[PDB]
Design a protein around this ligand. Structure first.
Ligand SMILES: Cc1cc2nc3c(=O)[nH]c(=O)nc-3n(C[C@H](O)[C@H](O)[C@H](O)COP(=O)(O)O)c2cc1C
Ligand SMILES: Cc1cc2nc3c(=O)[nH]c(=O)nc-3n(C[C@H](O)[C@H](O)[C@H](O)COP(=O)(O)O)c2cc1C
Lengths: 154, 162
């Protein structure tokens, strides 16, 4: 019981506005773990590593998830803050990608040894369904206190 | 109400572990297909750019065997360029629907045109199996995690904390 069509003219000014529209629909629809996102990290050799974590909060400063601060991710993040997030909503032909730096949350907002990270929003991509296979893709690049928007290839 | 019905499981013990991690992987994939999950072969591939920034995108698994996992891409797409500059990659099958995840770590090598033949310039890469991790759903949030590390033509196996 479907969805098809993502053209430049449905694009909101704040990407978080399109994100929320997609996250509700995911929860509206069946989709198990609407908030599950795959976070990628890179260790000191250049190797990426992946694992799912749940999105707990989000606003313009970034996306937040919690984790044990002594696990492979926390350790990798501390040597490399560059991470990537991907909401795998392929049940609805969708995908949301977020590139950004993982700053360690304060010991304040977490209210031991168990904290969380906030991933800033430097880029956010939206990939959408495709009857035929004309994948709609739109990238939001954070530029100069503004969002530079672009259409990409399928 | 269900003609094809449904079902789920629990308990990933060290005893039931096969000698070859691809036997367990084959079991979870059959089990993903049986429970009519969406795109059971969908996996998230993660590459890294020259600056050390990771990128991620869903790709579909087209074949696997002891040499590695295969997927197809266009040869002039961002992930293709990132691999040519850095073959290190991660694959993660997002089977949360079933409380599972599988992570594969290895190097992605371009397949010979002969390989691409099995099933613009659409090509294929094969990720080797240097590590494969398994994550299952144990009761009280107390999860089961196993890592298969490839070492000297064999597999070192170790449980991990949740
Ligand atoms: C649906 C689902 C939700 C999960 N949520 C979290 C979470 O919010 N934080 C976390 O650290 N791990 C979470 N995990 C476990 C991770 O996948 C991972 O095993 C763990 O964080 C340690 O990984 P690392 O050793 O790569 O650091 C979740 C797993 C699944 C399948
Ligand atoms: C269920 C599903 C399956 C997909 N399968 C493939 C695939 O097998 N190969 C591929 O190159 N892109 C596939 N895509 C699209 C990619 O995720 C992505 O848009 C594209 O290849 C991005 O490549 P780039 O990061 O190399 O620019 C799929 C998306 C979904 C939701």
């Amino acid at each position: 019981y479907t969805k098809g069509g993502l053209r430049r003219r449905d694009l909101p000014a704040d990407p978080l506005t399109l994100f929320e529209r997609w996250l509700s629909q995911a929860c509206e629809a069946k989709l198990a773990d609407p908030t599950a996102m795959v976070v990628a990290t890179v260790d000191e050799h250049g190797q990426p590593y992946q694992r799912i974590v749940l999105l707990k909060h989000y606003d313009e400063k970034g996306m937040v998830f919690y984790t044990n601060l002594g696990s492979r991710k926390a350790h990798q993040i501390e040597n490399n803050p560059r991470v990537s997030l991907l909401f795998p909503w392929h049940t609805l032909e969708r995908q949301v990608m977020v590139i950004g730096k993982a700053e360690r949350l304060s010991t304040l907002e977490v209210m031991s040894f168990w904290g969380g990270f906030r991933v800033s929003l430097e880029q956010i991509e939206f990939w959408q369904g495709g009857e035929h296979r004309l994948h709609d893709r739109f990238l939001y690049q954070r530029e100069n206190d503004a969002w530079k928007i672009d259409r990409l290839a399928p």
